[PDB]
Design a protein around this motif. Sequence first.
Motif, PDB file in Angstrom:
ATOM      1  N   UNK A  96      46.795  31.394  47.024  1.00 47.02           N
ATOM      2  CA  UNK A  96      45.672  30.493  46.782  1.00 47.02           C
ATOM      3  C   UNK A  96      44.500  31.224  46.139  1.00 47.02           C
ATOM      4  N   UNK A  97      44.405  32.540  46.338  1.00 43.69           N
ATOM      5  CA  UNK A  97      43.388  33.326  45.649  1.00 43.69           C
ATOM      6  C   UNK A  97      43.582  33.271  44.138  1.00 43.69           C
ATOM      7  N   UNK A  98      44.795  33.567  43.672  1.00 39.86           N
ATOM      8  CA  UNK A  98      45.082  33.475  42.246  1.00 39.86           C
ATOM      9  C   UNK A  98      45.013  32.037  41.761  1.00 39.86           C
ATOM     10  N   UNK A  99      45.324  31.080  42.637  1.00 37.98           N
ATOM     11  CA  UNK A  99      45.177  29.674  42.285  1.00 37.98           C
ATOM     12  C   UNK A  99      43.723  29.347  41.976  1.00 37.98           C
ATOM     13  N   UNK A 100      42.807  29.850  42.801  1.00 38.24           N
ATOM     14  CA  UNK A 100      41.388  29.648  42.552  1.00 38.24           C
ATOM     15  C   UNK A 100      40.879  30.503  41.404  1.00 38.24           C
ATOM     16  N   UNK A 101      41.593  31.574  41.056  1.00 37.19           N
ATOM     17  CA  UNK A 101      41.134  32.509  40.038  1.00 37.19           C
ATOM     18  C   UNK A 101      41.712  32.218  38.663  1.00 37.19           C
ATOM     19  N   UNK A 102      41.976  30.954  38.362  1.00 40.47           N
ATOM     20  CA  UNK A 102      42.347  30.522  37.028  1.00 40.47           C
ATOM     21  C   UNK A 102      41.107  29.991  36.313  1.00 40.47           C
ATOM     22  N   UNK A 148      40.150  44.710  36.271  1.00 40.71           N
ATOM     23  CA  UNK A 148      40.100  45.743  35.245  1.00 40.71           C
ATOM     24  C   UNK A 148      40.632  45.202  33.927  1.00 40.71           C
ATOM     25  N   UNK A 149      41.741  44.463  33.993  1.00 38.39           N
ATOM     26  CA  UNK A 149      42.279  43.811  32.805  1.00 38.39           C
ATOM     27  C   UNK A 149      41.305  42.770  32.266  1.00 38.39           C
ATOM     28  N   UNK A 150      40.620  42.056  33.161  1.00 44.02           N
ATOM     29  CA  UNK A 150      39.617  41.088  32.734  1.00 44.02           C
ATOM     30  C   UNK A 150      38.470  41.769  32.000  1.00 44.02           C
ATOM     31  N   UNK A 151      38.029  42.920  32.506  1.00 43.04           N
ATOM     32  CA  UNK A 151      36.989  43.692  31.838  1.00 43.04           C
ATOM     33  C   UNK A 151      37.456  44.158  30.468  1.00 43.04           C
ATOM     34  N   UNK A 152      38.704  44.622  30.379  1.00 43.82           N
ATOM     35  CA  UNK A 152      39.250  45.047  29.095  1.00 43.82           C
ATOM     36  C   UNK A 152      39.301  43.886  28.111  1.00 43.82           C
ATOM     37  N   UNK A 161      38.732  35.324  30.214  1.00 41.58           N
ATOM     38  CA  UNK A 161      39.714  36.287  29.725  1.00 41.58           C
ATOM     39  C   UNK A 161      41.037  35.545  29.590  1.00 41.58           C
ATOM     40  N   UNK A 162      41.181  34.859  28.454  1.00 43.28           N
ATOM     41  CA  UNK A 162      42.175  33.798  28.344  1.00 43.28           C
ATOM     42  C   UNK A 162      43.598  34.340  28.393  1.00 43.28           C
ATOM     43  N   UNK A 163      43.843  35.522  27.827  1.00 44.51           N
ATOM     44  CA  UNK A 163      45.200  36.048  27.867  1.00 44.51           C
ATOM     45  C   UNK A 163      45.466  36.816  29.151  1.00 44.51           C
ATOM     46  N   UNK A 164      44.450  37.489  29.695  1.00 47.80           N
ATOM     47  CA  UNK A 164      44.548  37.993  31.059  1.00 47.80           C
ATOM     48  C   UNK A 164      44.870  36.861  32.018  1.00 47.80           C
ATOM     49  N   UNK A 165      44.149  35.751  31.883  1.00 47.77           N
ATOM     50  CA  UNK A 165      44.414  34.583  32.707  1.00 47.77           C
ATOM     51  C   UNK A 165      45.805  34.025  32.439  1.00 47.77           C
ATOM     52  N   UNK A 166      46.248  34.045  31.180  1.00 42.70           N
ATOM     53  CA  UNK A 166      47.578  33.539  30.851  1.00 42.70           C
ATOM     54  C   UNK A 166      48.662  34.358  31.536  1.00 42.70           C
ATOM     55  N   UNK A 167      48.545  35.684  31.467  1.00 43.55           N
ATOM     56  CA  UNK A 167      49.502  36.548  32.147  1.00 43.55           C
ATOM     57  C   UNK A 167      49.448  36.334  33.650  1.00 43.55           C
ATOM     58  N   UNK A 208      44.810  48.997  26.422  1.00 40.80           N
ATOM     59  CA  UNK A 208      44.715  49.086  27.879  1.00 40.80           C
ATOM     60  C   UNK A 208      45.327  47.865  28.557  1.00 40.80           C
ATOM     61  N   UNK A 209      45.280  46.715  27.880  1.00 37.17           N
ATOM     62  CA  UNK A 209      45.892  45.494  28.392  1.00 37.17           C
ATOM     63  C   UNK A 209      47.369  45.710  28.688  1.00 37.17           C
ATOM     64  N   UNK A 210      48.099  46.360  27.779  1.00 40.17           N
ATOM     65  CA  UNK A 210      49.531  46.524  28.010  1.00 40.17           C
ATOM     66  C   UNK A 210      49.797  47.515  29.139  1.00 40.17           C
ATOM     67  N   UNK A 211      48.951  48.543  29.276  1.00 40.26           N
ATOM     68  CA  UNK A 211      49.122  49.486  30.377  1.00 40.26           C
ATOM     69  C   UNK A 211      48.945  48.797  31.723  1.00 40.26           C
ATOM     70  N   UNK A 212      47.848  48.061  31.894  1.00 44.83           N
ATOM     71  CA  UNK A 212      47.666  47.378  33.169  1.00 44.83           C
ATOM     72  C   UNK A 212      48.673  46.248  33.343  1.00 44.83           C
ATOM     73  N   UNK A 213      49.177  45.689  32.242  1.00 49.19           N
ATOM     74  CA  UNK A 213      50.205  44.662  32.339  1.00 49.19           C
ATOM     75  C   UNK A 213      51.504  45.233  32.884  1.00 49.19           C
ATOM     76  N   UNK A 214      51.926  46.397  32.391  1.00 49.89           N
ATOM     77  CA  UNK A 214      53.127  46.992  32.965  1.00 49.89           C
ATOM     78  C   UNK A 214      52.865  47.500  34.376  1.00 49.89           C
ATOM     79  N   UNK A 215      51.627  47.900  34.676  1.00 46.61           N
ATOM     80  CA  UNK A 215      51.288  48.284  36.043  1.00 46.61           C
ATOM     81  C   UNK A 215      51.481  47.117  37.004  1.00 46.61           C
TER      82      UNK A 215
END
Length: 227
Positions: A77-83, A17-21, A87-93, A30-37
Amino acid sequence: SLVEQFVFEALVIYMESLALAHADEKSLGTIQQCCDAIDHLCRIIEKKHVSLNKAKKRRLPRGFPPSASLCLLDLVKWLLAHCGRPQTECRHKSIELFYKFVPLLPGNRSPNLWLKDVLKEEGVSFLINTFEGGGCGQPSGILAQPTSLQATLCWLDLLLAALECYNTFIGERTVGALQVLGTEAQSSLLKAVAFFLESIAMHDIIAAEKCFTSPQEGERYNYSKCT
């Protein structure tokens, strides 16, 4: 019980969802809302993780299409593969949070040796898994220069994501630059340097691709170039 059953699916769902945003409009909050979520998520899972530390058969999230007993290392390993995501700042977070989760493994902290044990199998696949950027790893950026302004923006922010990944890796001091420099044949940085030769500070209007000011509204292109 339900957090033991339904978190990791919620984690992955909120991250796309953050990636879509990020994909549609990063200006909206919306990025900050899902970030605090996901901050609430990471806090609550780091409070209680030992049940998640084991492989407990939970509901399969969107990712990991094969079915298996869900474990913490599974989504590790899922998040490891999902770099290497556009969505560069979504990916950064995501990667910052991941680097924080790696010590949460019971028997393993996050030293450079743990990443080296991980990398032992990844002699050269490290060049693509973490660096899908650079033109889909490489060739698209070569093709990007002849051939479409939104495609140029896509390749540009893909390069941004790749270089942000590089910055994060070197900043943690958990990996040397020479681990990827020279050791494995990568020309994404060379293509970026050629891009700076051909585009940065003189080609502020045209990408030299001959396939496309306010009528073009290239101002966001200029801001992405400055970024």
